[model samples]
Target chain A: GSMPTLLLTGFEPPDNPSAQAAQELHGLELPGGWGVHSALLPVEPHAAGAALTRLLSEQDPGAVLLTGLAAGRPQVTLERVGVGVMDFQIPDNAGQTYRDQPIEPDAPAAYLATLPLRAILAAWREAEIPGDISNSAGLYVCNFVLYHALHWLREHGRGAVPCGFLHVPANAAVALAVPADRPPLPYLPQSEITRAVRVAAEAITAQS
Target chain B: SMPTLLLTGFEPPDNPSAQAAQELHGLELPGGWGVHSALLPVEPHAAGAALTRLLSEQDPGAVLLTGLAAGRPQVTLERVGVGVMDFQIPDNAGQTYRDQPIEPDAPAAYLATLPLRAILAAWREAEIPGDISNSAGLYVCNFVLYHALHWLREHGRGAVPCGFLHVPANAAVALAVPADRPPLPYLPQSEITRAVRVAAEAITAQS
Candidate 1:
């Protein structure tokens, strides 16, 4: 029998904190026997969306957590909303960038995260971790993926499933890779980044 | 003109250490030494970056890092900074770690280069409840402290004495904690402020 599962996904590039966290949490078992199905998405916007849509239909997970890198941010941020936009600052892994494009031409302009935002914040605070709710998930592949997931869930009659996006800072390995001439960027250890993702997943599991 | 002594503390909500650091900014000690203080982010990486920048900009003769340790009964002068980081709670940045080295290539620990015995003696002379604690607990405080010493060593500033201090929650924080949580000990902000000043004086005198 297939167990109820949480679909956790992150971007490609092995050193990316979100990707590393997702891969680290692939087999995580939550309370009440909920397991995780982790996937790594391409950085290309269209391909990433197609991959996510396929996974949603295949896994039919009870919950979803989408994660991506926020290079210089100091905290793990939970996204409050995803907009129907694609405006990349830099080329993604596939050497593609966008300007003023709509993720879905006719869908609603925005979709709010279905996860219990306040409950997760309260949980982080109680656990003595620093976390915040961010109003923007940016105009890049991250936002595209988030909007894609939310819209897919709603259209498939699974809108009630807890789903949202999270942004994690660069891990130490990424930071160390920066050029010596460049200004130093902040980074958390891989262990810490993974812990934040786990805590977020646990928060979702608790409510589900 | 005298060399500067840099002081820093993290600004978590209701953190007494940050309050003390803020209060002590621009303090002047005997023999014309000036204290330069800055508030550090509670995130380990950011704090390390900020501290590294400050050390470069100020070129201080000594350094003191401070942070909160709620539930502790009194002020503590940390004696060592272990390279390991095992955060029990996520930092203000919502990052947590377990049994990871703060710096992979650095040694397992660095003894505080600050004048520990002198600071303790000064606190005793001032009748402040304080002691030298062996463990800084693998959190941001320890990370910053270890980073500071390592940075100084790498940059040929090893003679620059540096250390960290831990303060218990202030009255405001203690009172605001949920009732279900066990009661925490607290000191008045004024006393905590004074204790930091005394520690500064000791450092200034020795330097």
Candidate 2:
């Protein structure tokens, strides 16, 4: 009917590296013809799920990409599977920790990333960005949003939509600034993380 | 046999809530009485059930529950338990309820039966940082407290003393705050532990 739209989402982190990546894709240059709309989901599960649901109905984007921060990661990662569990090593901003809790009861045990995994990684390689395929998204708000998004698509018979999640490493400068008493972690520059996200976005857009 | 003082806490949905109860794991009360502490897993449906089973088993003359309030800087004694199950996040049971009654037929709220004024005074005299709190929020903490009170009321044991306490993150966790995060509020673990022991003695001594 109209130009195809792409929905990009990110989470507010202890630092919001995910949102930083999404912000870079805000002014993204898509080679193909697709209108891009980006938004931020609250780190809370109930709120994030509700926001994503509302955004989908309002825009009905042809494809959706969700991004989150993995502070200790050295590079961006494309998540391949989202588990039903919400077991958390740390509490979210809202102070919620899910221990062996399912995101949805009676739902499937897990949802695979519907995006082209190999293709995204290929695009990252071509762009010379540090990236790879991640099997586990970890049991946090990141997985919480992905599982709910997939569930929403299935419920509306929109499972065909190109939907997936990506993890962006915390900026090196930021990670280094963390207290030394805590173990030092691998980090990537925000510039590199954002660029990889843009590439992933373009690749996902091409699928549409 | 001397009466039992039942204490309950929640497991790490994150960290602070779990630590508060663990501090009381082997605490001893002053009287010829005994203290039994339990850490409930974050399961929404199961937390209340587990506490109920413990109450049946221990038949403690009094009960006190503790959970972490990340936003709080010190110990807080909750004054009332609201009869609602509105959760901002899914509980460990993967359940979410919005504006729903914890128990459809129960009262809107239940005032804690503990001697709160004496408890606060005891903390102040002991130099433990604590205060009386008006709200427990509509989360698992409130849910468990209300359920316990409801069970007591229905079982015609309304005379049993019951209350809930909220603690903040400990000092070490606060020290590790990322540069992007605001300096968080925290209490010393030693102080928190001592506070719990004092609260237990206060409750048992008064009863």
Candidate 3:
């Protein structure tokens, strides 16, 4: 089947609750000649961008939806833009640190998510998910991935493909159940989060 | 056992940090005190573990970690190390950590116990440039400081004074600065080494 593909990605576990929801969404059965492909991007910026670029080239997908954990955020937020900056408040799993570094010195100041965010959320009514558009994705690896992905798309003449970034919270019960030694963080259930992701993907994959 | 002063500096394969490590490696210390230096990797994962091993072996009287903060004007003695780590760039291992803890169970922050005021006074009295800074930028510099302090507490090595020092880029790089920005700030390798030596010696003398 010459079905167009929708590339879905999330981060690896422990550091990434979005992985749980991403894996869940990939497992679901969806309709259309538009097939699905899923993989997890590294939490590190350099690696995440490399992986996103590789996937985008290999899959040549009709759309890409990236998911990552936003520990303090209260809902399933769609990232609106990614700045070409990296100012981390903490290190990622790989023990890297950046202090006011630029992600791509040659990249534009920022790149907006090309996905049909409003259209996706318009269908949010029946899905019963609490989410909204996020103006800034912060300058972490999440934005790093989004910016590079969009940059690659623009460069390789693949500008027709829509791409987006989604942030999901840690599962509340899961966080509570973790060993008392780990830091405590708020969470949201996988069902609602994954459902929102699917609806967003569907609305985006069909957008003009 | 002879009282020992342990100095740590990042090796980003650069001049300033590597120079700091090299200068302190074989230096003489006063009061029958000995000095041992460890060149830490720029990567955060290895930096902590390396320091831990060195600390175990040396059991020094105090510890001071040094790193390069390009564009900064002079020597900076970090006052506290925060628990959080957010890297604006990947470390040597190409790893990044965002809004994550250096140690999950450790205190939210660890103030340097390296006799900061005396260290600053010593540098000033010696006419060497230096200042006391609050943020270590939540990077490997802070990561190692927090990890070292936490290890001291966790292993019952209570109040083992530890701190971080930052040096700006050196003169060679600054000389080639781009025209758009204000004149790039930098210190010569010798001045950086001298400032660090004064601070390190001061930490040992006071601690």
Best prediction by lDDT: 1
Mark the regions of model 2 whose C-alpha exceeds 4 Å error after superposition. Answer: A27-29, B1-207
| lDDT per residue as tens, model 3, B1-207 | 988788877775355877777777867788877768878888878888898899898998888788888878988887656676778788888899866766655555555778877887998898977776656776788788878877877877757778888988888667766788778688889888888888878877876
Candidate 3 docking band: incorrect
> What tens-digit string does per-residue lDDT give for candidate 1 at A76-106?
7899999999999999877888899988778
* B-chain TM-scores per prediction: 0.97, 0.92, 0.93
Q: RMSD of model 1, in Å?
A: 17.1
lDDT of 1 by residue, B93-125 (tens): 788998998876788988899999899789767
lDDT of 2 by residue, B125-177 (tens): 99887876656777889888888888888889889999998888777668777
lDDT of 2 at A116: 79
- Give residue A73's error in model 2 in angstroms: 1.3
lDDT of each: 0.85, 0.79, 0.77
Candidate 2: residue pairs that collide: A97-B13
Residue by residue across A168-189, what tens digits does model 2's lDDT show? 8878667877897998878887
Report the backbone clash tally of model 1: 3
Model 3, residue B50: distance off in Å is 0.7
